[PDB]
Amino acid sequence: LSLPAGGKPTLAVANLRHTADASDVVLRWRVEHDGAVAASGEVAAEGSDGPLRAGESATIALPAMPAAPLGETWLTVEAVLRDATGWAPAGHPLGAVQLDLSAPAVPTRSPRPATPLDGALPVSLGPATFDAGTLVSLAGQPVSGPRLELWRAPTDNDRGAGFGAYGPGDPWLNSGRGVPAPSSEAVWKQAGLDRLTRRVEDVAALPDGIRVRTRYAAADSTHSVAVEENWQLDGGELCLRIDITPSAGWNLVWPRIGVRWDLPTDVDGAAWFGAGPRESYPDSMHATMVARHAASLEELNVPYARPQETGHRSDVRWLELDRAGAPWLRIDAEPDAAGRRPGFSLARHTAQEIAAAGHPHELPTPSHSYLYVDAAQHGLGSRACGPDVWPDFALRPEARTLKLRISPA
Amino acid sequence: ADVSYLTDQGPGSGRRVPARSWLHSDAPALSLNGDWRFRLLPAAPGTAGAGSVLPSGETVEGVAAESYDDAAWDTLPVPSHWVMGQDGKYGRPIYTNVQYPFPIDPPHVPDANPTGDFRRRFDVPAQWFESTTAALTLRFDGVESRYKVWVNGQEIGVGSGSRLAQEFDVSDALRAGSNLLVVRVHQWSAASYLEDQDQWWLPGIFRDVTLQARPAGGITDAWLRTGWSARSGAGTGTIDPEITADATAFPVTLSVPELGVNVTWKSAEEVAPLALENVEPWSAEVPRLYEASVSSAAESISVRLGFRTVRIVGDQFLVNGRRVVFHGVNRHETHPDRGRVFDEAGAREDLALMKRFNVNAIRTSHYPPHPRLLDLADEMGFWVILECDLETHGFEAGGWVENPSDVPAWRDALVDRMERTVERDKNHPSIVMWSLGNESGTGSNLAAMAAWAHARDSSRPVHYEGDYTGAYTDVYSRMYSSIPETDSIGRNDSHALLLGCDSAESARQRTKPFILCEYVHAMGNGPGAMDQYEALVDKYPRLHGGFVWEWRDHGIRTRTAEGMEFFAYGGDFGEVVHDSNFVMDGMVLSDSTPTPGLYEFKQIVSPIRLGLSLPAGGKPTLAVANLRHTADASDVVLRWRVEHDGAVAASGEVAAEGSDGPLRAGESATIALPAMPAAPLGETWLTVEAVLRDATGWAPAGHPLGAVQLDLSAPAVPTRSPRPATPLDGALPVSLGPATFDAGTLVSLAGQPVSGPRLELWRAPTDNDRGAGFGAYGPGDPWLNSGRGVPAPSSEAVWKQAGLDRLTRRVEDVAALPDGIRVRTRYAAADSTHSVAVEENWQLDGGELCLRIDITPSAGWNLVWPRIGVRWDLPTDVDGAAWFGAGPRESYPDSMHATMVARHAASLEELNVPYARPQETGHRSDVRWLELDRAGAPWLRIDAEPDAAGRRPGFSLARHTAQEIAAAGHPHELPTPSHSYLYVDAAQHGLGSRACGPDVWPDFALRPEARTLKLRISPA
Amino acid sequence: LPDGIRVRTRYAAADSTHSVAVEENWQLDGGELCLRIDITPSAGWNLVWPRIGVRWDLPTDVDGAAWFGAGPRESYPDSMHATMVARHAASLEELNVPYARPQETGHRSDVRWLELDRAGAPWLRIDAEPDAAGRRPGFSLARHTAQEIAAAGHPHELPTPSHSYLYVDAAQHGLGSRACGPDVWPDFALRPEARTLKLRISPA
Ligand SMILES: [Cl-]
């Protein structure tokens, strides 16, 4: 899909089949405004002489689709089978593509950075309650956090060491076999990434807010990550900026950069606008659409035979957490200076507990639900048997900012 | 008395006022500039190693007291540096590049710590104490380094951040009538660790000291954040105002008369964004400003609005929706008499000179300039990278251990520096990037500066070249990356590792816009490669150009013990540690003379790119491309001329037009010029220049932007050389036309005593010839090892080891020819097994004196040669030359773009460039003929024939040998001339930039070869 | 201090991260002036050191010395065989060798005590106590500093003297023959170490 300067949305179609023409296929399109269908239709897959032949390409101009003045406008086109076969229903999708047609972004105006004040800390800020600067509840429910996390429950590929690692050299050298190296899990454990400790440097009032500065580091390590939270009320909304600024020494792939919130166990589902419906990671984004999505815990997370990282939803505009069936908390996320959006995961156990379990049935009975809001996740690759994560999708140490607005749903 | 303030790592102390803009306000104000009472102490009072620094009976901070008697004290101008303009009375400047001039022991500084006490009386109007005034503010725009302030004996506070503004609240200390201000300034402090810029160390109160009376219900700060997007017609402007003021200030009115805006806000809550139709955008090419004011009943602020929007989209740096290519320079305030003290008239002229050489951007290396400079950049049109005052480069050698950038004790200080940088200058449209500082490694504190800037100002990206892995910056910035590495950065099919990065970090840096924050190091004779870097920018959209290091030489005017004036550099002031002439690394000399390297820059970065060709049977065809960011080419005229052996035969003008009127930015066109038939004899050259039709604030009408030539000459007629002759027995000739010989030795030419020719391989080494940072390019494929070369000594080291500066001449034989003479000689250094054979065949051929010189090296020579040429020793009254060839300025194999083939003429002072350290200069290339003059009167002509390969020689004329020049550290150290020396060079080595940057690119490097000169010599 | 003074100083070159801490304890003990100097280098020093000592700046009329220790001529760790322990005396001219190129010369080793004279008249006496390892200091008396000497190509290029300089060295580097031959044999080469000087200073 493309939008030629001055034109209409233009659909390129290539029939990549070996023999069959595209007569069994119909192309269905929809335009959605913030996830809701505003217009839709369907076109036949035709070439220069009837149905698009095996090995033939064509282009089709679709109807004009003016951008909605506010919010986001997305075009999706899906190739589907017209008729049922012995193995699929009529309307079975073969594959899809999207085109962002959104009107120019209206950035939210963030609160000005504020000088800390002497004096008492606020007890409540909108839906948040604090005890001596420690978050204790959000929107009527007990909640702890945010807590920096770098650890993720290692994937099978994070545990692999057959192929070499791509980090240390040009990946095009050595026949693309990488540089002999320990597994990612081995280096992460050796760095103590699974056992970071939190130390409070200082807590201070802001005008209509609170600033908390913390420093995270593993026992027996010289490396650290400073974290600063600025909670501010801005026009009745609770704004939270979190700046994460690592020390200089860090020289390994990081599994993730995010913060964890500890929630009641009855927080059991989420809705979001962003990539979905399933989990996605930097080198695994093709089967995603930007739309409105919703899932319970069991739909969010894949029950892989060995418990590991699962369930990350990328490129999130907003999420809404459901509790005992009903909407409870809304988090809006603003893109950072580089236009990057965070992701989230919702889990019944911490990444440390998951990493410890050999099978799902070996996990303890849950005491919390955990929300991870991730600025970044490492790619997946296939190093259990095959190439490491391709360098473009590999996470190395970096400073990140999360810009959140938190409200009762 | 507590002197812990001297080593404190915090931002400063006392009655500090929150950082805000430098604003043009009508609030009552007065300047405290003038001649203050001053004394210099050798140490900081009250420190452990300063037990008896003060006069008997004076207490550590007694100087502050209103009762203190300073009647006998000298006075010192404020603003100034105490080490400048005083004949050394209070010490001298100290130059270091990277090394700190004190032990690396943070936060401690030496006991020998020049400390200046300043005392000033001044009057404050009684009116300033009326209820119409809410507060009284004392402002320091610049003090090096840390200082403590007392007013009427009360301690007010301590400042840090030498090039950053600091305001203090003196409301409670001042009185109506006469007041006292005392400032104690230390040269060294904990702040000096944060200020290791490559420049002179210059203590003192070097920017303005002022008082302002803050109006009750005034506006403390405003930020009129502007934006622009394209429409039909002019386009749409936006203002997103931020007003910092008390509730009593409202109503506040924003007025922009030209745009018809007059908006009154009745409370803080009404202050809101506005969109304005028919707004012309601001850019460096077209710096359109709109006058505006923001006022309450009590105070009016005048702003000039430039509407422009900066956006990064993937790897593109856009302003107003179009990619910006930076043709910039690194600049800081510099003056041989005044140091870093600002002078508006001088600054305007400086920026005008930049514009005349096609500079469109300035990086403020490596701290904010005087705030007034930014008004000039807004008005004259430069893209600006405004850089915070931070450089900890000296921590590198010890592996960055204790680097303030990653030490928590310094964090508050570093973030405060960024806050003061951003707040002062946030209103200026010329600023399109904030920079965190320079060469300070990496660390959590640098990332915290970036996080603060991002939180405060989303309108401008964050630049910092020490962020090699791209952990917290929005652009990828490098300094002196080679051509191979820069190519690797710009291209989309390379996963090669970049400096300091693993493969993932290298990939992420390639996702951002790229700039060279420093490149083509301009020190001495050079740089080469500017064309190679520009060709990468042409080729790869990710590459956005760069900033030359640097604009000006920083020479300090001083006198020898005998009273001879000169520009001093590092070490000339008796420094213990110093970095010599590395402070002399500008495109412009200390007296403001543009060097040949600046003319080369100008041509290469011309906004109107010209090409010439002659299609078979067609007419001369001119290709024209408008490479500008926004402006069409209506201001430009294309002037052509054809010259027959240098003399104009025909000329004309052509408009730069595209498909629809004037050639638009980004548009290309071709135009057939008139037919220009070749002269049947001699050479015919077409020159086309792009010139400004009309005058600007900074240039006259007809100011050239760039040029191109095309050779249209008739096929060459090769001259008939005398047949090689067999030598005869018997008497040598004495007289061969204009030459006279004594027993085969030349003694005169055309009535004047002359010696020669003498083979010469030595040249007086350029600063680049003396560099050894990057490796040399000879021993390997230059595209390997990221273009970093092979580690190796400097060219000068290998030349001296080989004895190239001390070749000896041995005559093998001398023989008569029929109407001539043959001389065979052999050249070699003492203790060397290598040699060069030289044969001279002088022959009269139809009454013309022909000289063929064949230079045939032995086999074992394995190093670069500086030159291959012959030297002639002439009378000192030989003092000018005319030639037909490349000119009018010196040129070298990797620096030929700003030359034209034509007839040129120059005296000795015009021929040779007075570089701060004497070195190779003055070579004129591609010479057809040269004529030497004796005080304007033509004396000797030499015609040169091209060799078998079509190569033409060049020449230089000098007052001293290459050997004497090489031995002199400054021009004034050269002896009184006893000869003029003509060097006729078959070859010269290229320039490169190895003093800091790549070696000479291999295509332009001189390696041992045999060469022939074919000359005809006649009286002129 | 009770009947004394303690001075703590730190020595380091510009642009260096290394340093040497020095503590002086001056204490009157039974009418005698005792001075203990403890020299304690930082960790990273990784090169041979020329000497470890202290310099005193004196009037130019201090122009001779008597001592009890090794003599009568200069001696260094790898050049001790022609010394005898005895009472010796020398003028400046007899103390220092005029080598064609001015360099280190004049070090007297294994000193129990030294007396400085002004025109033959004894002025100052310094007694040195052996350190914990039994090591004794040495001394040199010079008309110029080691820096000034290093800078001069010939004796006649030195400036008119403005002081006499006494160096009391805990250690000197050996001599070897590296201008053409083996380096100093390791047994005699000086590497960074902490040293103490224990002195008693009196009028002679
Ligand atoms: Cl913890």
Ligand SMILES: [Cl-]
């Ligand atoms: Cl000779």
Ligand SMILES: [Mg+2]
């Ligand atoms: Mg130059």
Ligand code: NA
């Ligand atoms: Na410096």
Ligand code: NA
């Ligand atoms: Na420099």
